[PDB]
């Protein structure tokens, strides 16, 4: 098969969105000291390193311990964790639950909120009969950690490491419950203590990998990019595109139309190492061009620039074909 | 070397208060949460709690909720635990140690502090 | 919740024996258990993590097995430094618990 139909004109024009926070794609981020992802993440072997499907739906693992700190049981943190690599149910990896985001956890306690987390909503509930602990509902940061649960700490390696939910609220009443289930959507949010935005989201050093996890360095001076769209904060909820607060953009590796895409068929035989399958990017004035690894990573020509290319101008997408990336790919404004 | 430090042996009425402390030195302090387990005299280990190092939060078995106290000083690489108004039940001997779960190692208390005796008396 | 109970209380041995002590949980604490060795006078120190790991720098003959609400502990060929007591600690949902103890006396 030929990969050009799997990135398409409404793709990056209003209709696509990233495969982290499905939020609609309105920019391009260059990362130019490269960059990892797994999670929701497709290569052109029909295969990921990370643990979750192209689907955006709960968050569930049904076998870790919660606990509250404190003396008072009322309007207090809720804290679940669990060890990597016992989701049992998910076929896909047993590193963490279908949905898990990947990003390392943001400490935090009392008032104060964690900057720059990923946050969910949902609670703890009851795992020999399904029943919610219901004065456990609120929003919680994950993430990866090591120390949990005496002192959480952010790590980016799955092996040996724990998810951890936290809520960044105090819960109506919380318990201590062994083996208890997790239960929060997977479409997030990102946690600021005030109404500020702040960078993009997740930073490449927040990012958590798998093993064997192949990475999207620098080839010359085409660097590998991030699809960048507009994420809801909780410190402004109401924010949206061109806030008076500021702007907040979250950041995913691949458009899920094109992880959706690429985990259905296999793609082995239309690219080797070396090559990009590039398409061209029509704006009003100009063009530019993408290029798509066979590890999954989009590249473009921009070199050390980390200034985010803003797509609302872009008019069509047409495909161009392999080529070698010892060429530099096209950049024209 | 990485070790815990706990503060020396003390006497104290029933109902009179008592600060232990307990310091690190060899690792860094706000990275990994502190413990504190108790034991009677000739009785085995009971788990009383943890303070989380980075933020201050402490948790508490249910039991200690009422009377005991976590706190720290992190200028000073040091941790406390403070009990009020103090019985017969209390006299122990009191560890701290150095939380480890993570990189192929834990959970586990990796490093205890000597402990530090707490003997009550009228 | 989850209690410990550890057996035996004591046992008498001596140096070239073999001994396994026995840690059951009232519910299943999924290997998050771990074994402390304790000398008269002193501050315990690991043995075992996770069941069937063993800590840094400690011997070979000790030897940490279970699953489920299970586990024990085997020293193969007891030498003169292993005198002392043993618990078992669980790491499922707060409280952490510890067992009650096996103390392993010298024969004679």
């Known amino acids: 098969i030929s990969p050009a139909d799997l990135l398409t004109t409404p793709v990056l024009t209003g209709v696509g969105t990233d495969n982290r926070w499905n939020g609609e794609i309105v920019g391009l981020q260059p990362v130019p000291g490269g960059f990892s992802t797994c999670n929701r993440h497709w290569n052109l072997n029909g295969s990921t390193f990370g643990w979750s499907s192209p689907r955006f739906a709960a968050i569930d693992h049904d076998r870790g311990n919660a606990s509250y700190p404190g003396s008072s049981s009322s309007n207090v943190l809720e804290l679940w964790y669990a060890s990597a690599g016992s989701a049992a149910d998910n076929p896909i990896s047993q590193i963490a639950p279908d949905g898990f985001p990947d990003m390392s956890f943001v400490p935090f306690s009392g008032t104060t909120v964690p900057t720059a987390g990923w946050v969910g909503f949902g609670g703890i509930w009851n795992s020999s009969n399904g029943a919610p602990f219901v004065t456990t509902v609120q929003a919680y940061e994950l993430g990866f950690a090591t120390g949990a649960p005496s002192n959480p700490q952010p790590t980016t390696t799955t092996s040996g490491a724990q998810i951890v939910a936290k809520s960044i609220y105090g819960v109506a009443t919380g318990i201590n419950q062994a083996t208890a289930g997790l239960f929060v959507m997977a479409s997030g949010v990102i946690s600021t203590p005030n109404s500020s935005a702040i960078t993009y989201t997740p930073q490449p050093n927040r990012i958590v990998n798998a093993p064997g996890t192949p990475a999207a360095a620098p080839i010359g001076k085409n660097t590998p990019i991030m699809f960048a769209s507009v994420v809801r904060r909780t410190g402004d909820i109401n924010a949206e595109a061109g806030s008076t607060n500021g702007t907040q953009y979250g950041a995913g590796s691949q458009p899920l139309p094109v992880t959706v895409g690429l985990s259905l068929n296999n793609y082995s035989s239309a690219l080797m190492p070396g090559q990009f399958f590039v398409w061209q990017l029509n704006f009003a004035s100009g063009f530019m061009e993408l290029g798509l690894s066979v590890d999954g990573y989009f590249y473009a020509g921009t070199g050390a620039s980390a200034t985010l290319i803003d797509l609302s101008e872009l008019v069509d997408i047409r495909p161009v074909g392999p080529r070698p990336s010892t060429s530099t790919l096209v950049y024209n404004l | 070397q990485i070790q815990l430090v706990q503060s020396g042996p003390e006497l104290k009425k029933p109902g009179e208060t008592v600060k232990i402390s307990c310091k690190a030195s060899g690792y860094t302090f706000t990275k990994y949460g502190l413990n504190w387990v108790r034991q009677a005299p000739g009785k085995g280990l009971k788990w009383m709690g943890w303070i989380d190092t980075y933020t201050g939060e402490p948790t508490y078995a249910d039991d200690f909720k009422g009377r005991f106290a976590f706190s720290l000083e992190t200028s000073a690489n040091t941790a406390y635990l403070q009990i009020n108004y103090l019985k017969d039940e209390d006299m122990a001997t009191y560890f701290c140690?150095?939380?480890?779960?993570?990189?192929?190692?834990?959970?586990?208390?990796?490093?205890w502090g000597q402990g530090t005796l707490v003997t009550v008396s009228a | 919740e989850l209690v410990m109970t550890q057996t035996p209380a004591s046992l008498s041995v001596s140096v070239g024996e073999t001994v396994t002590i026995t840690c059951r949980a009232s519910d299943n604490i999924y290997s998050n258990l771990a074994w402390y060795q304790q000398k008269q006078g002193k501050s315990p120190q690991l043995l075992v993590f996770?069941?069937?790991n063993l800590a840094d720098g400690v011997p070979s003959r000790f030897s940490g097995s279970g699953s489920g609400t299970q586990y024990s502990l085997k020293i193969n060929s007891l030498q003169s430094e292993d005198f002392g007591n043993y618990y078992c600690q669980h790491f499922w949902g707060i409280p952490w618990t510890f067992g009650g103890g096996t103390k392993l006396e010298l024969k004679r």
């Open positions: 140690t150095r939380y480890d779960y993570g990189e192929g190692s834990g959970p586990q208390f990796t490093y």
């Open positions: 996770a069941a069937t």
